[PDB]
Design a binder for this molecule. Structure first.
Ligand SMILES: Nc1ncnc2c1ncn2[C@@H]1O[C@H](COP(=O)(O)OP(=O)(O)OP(=O)(O)OP(=O)(O)OP(=O)(O)OC[C@H]2O[C@@H](n3cnc4c(N)ncnc43)[C@H](O)[C@@H]2O)[C@@H](O)[C@H]1O
Length: 214
């Protein structure tokens, strides 16, 4: 089963990627998690990426496509995979299309800009695992601490409100057209599309996607 998650930064894609991984047993390919992993390893990728991400900009299509190609051409990607953060631009999409890769489901998380900025102030991560929490809407069971390890949570560096606002501008210019892109793909029979209300609580969003995938 091959799935793509679309939606503005903060819409809760990664939050629901976790659940979809652990309930249908397909790997999460997160471009954001891979970039943040590269910084932590201190690789060449990590060094090129850090400044771009800090500035709330998109990393070049070439680097991203190479990165995602590598991680697909690993093992256990025969049963399926879940893309989260990719594609992010039309060229990223067309590259996948031209390489002959089709997806079964394209899932869109609609959430307006207002909420997005209010959300991200409450976002907390367990940096080793990439587990994501919201202090109000999806809180850790112990304030400030990862549920699994008890390790202190941090805020992401690119989560200051200036940087967030840039990510949304980029999203509306570069990424939003992908909605049209995959609607049309769905219309031609090449995939299934579905929208959801991501403003809903995290259990109600979980529910709609059970209701959608089966
Ligand atoms: N493909 C690419 N091409 C070029 N560059 C790339 C790239 N991919 C990555 N990059 C680079 O690096 C950065 C992008 O970062 P990236 O890692 O791709 O995104 P996030 O930063 O992972 O943003 P999503 O945009 O992934 O947010 P989310 O939808 O997953 O929702 P989340 O569950 O976290 O939720 C938000 C907060 O949501 C709270 N919350 C979740 N659900 C609910 C709910 N249902 N109700 C209320 N609150 C909720 C969450 O718990 C948490 O508090 C890129 O911008 C660029 O810098």
């Amino acid at each position: 089963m091959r799935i793509i998650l679309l939606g503005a930064p903060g819409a809760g894609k990664g939050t629901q990627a976790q659940f979809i991984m652990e309930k249908y047993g397909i790997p999460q390919i997160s471009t954001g998690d891979m970039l943040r992993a590269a910084i932590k390893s201190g690789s060449e990728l990590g060094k090129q990426a850090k400044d771009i991400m800090d500035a709330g900009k998109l990393v070049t299509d070439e680097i991203i496509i190479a990165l995602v190609k590598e991680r697909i051409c690993q093992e256990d990607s025969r049963n399926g995979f879940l893309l989260d953060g990719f594609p992010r631009t039309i060229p990223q999409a067309d590259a996948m299309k031209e390489a002959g890769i089709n997806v079964d489901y394209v899932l869109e998380f609609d959430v307006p800009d207002e909420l997005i900025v209010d959300r991200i102030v409450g976002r907390r991560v367990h940096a080793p695992s990439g587990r994501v929490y919201h202090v109000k809407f999806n809180p850790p069971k112990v304030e400030g601490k990862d549920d699994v390890t008890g390790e202190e949570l941090t805020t992401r560096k690119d989560d200051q409100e200036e940087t967030v606002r840039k990510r949304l501008v980029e999203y509306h210019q570069m990424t939003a057209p992908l909605i049209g892109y995959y609607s049309k793909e769905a219309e031609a029979g090449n995939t299934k599309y579905a929208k959801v209300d991501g403003t809903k609580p995290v259990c109600e969003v979980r529910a709609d996607l059970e209701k959608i995938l089966g």
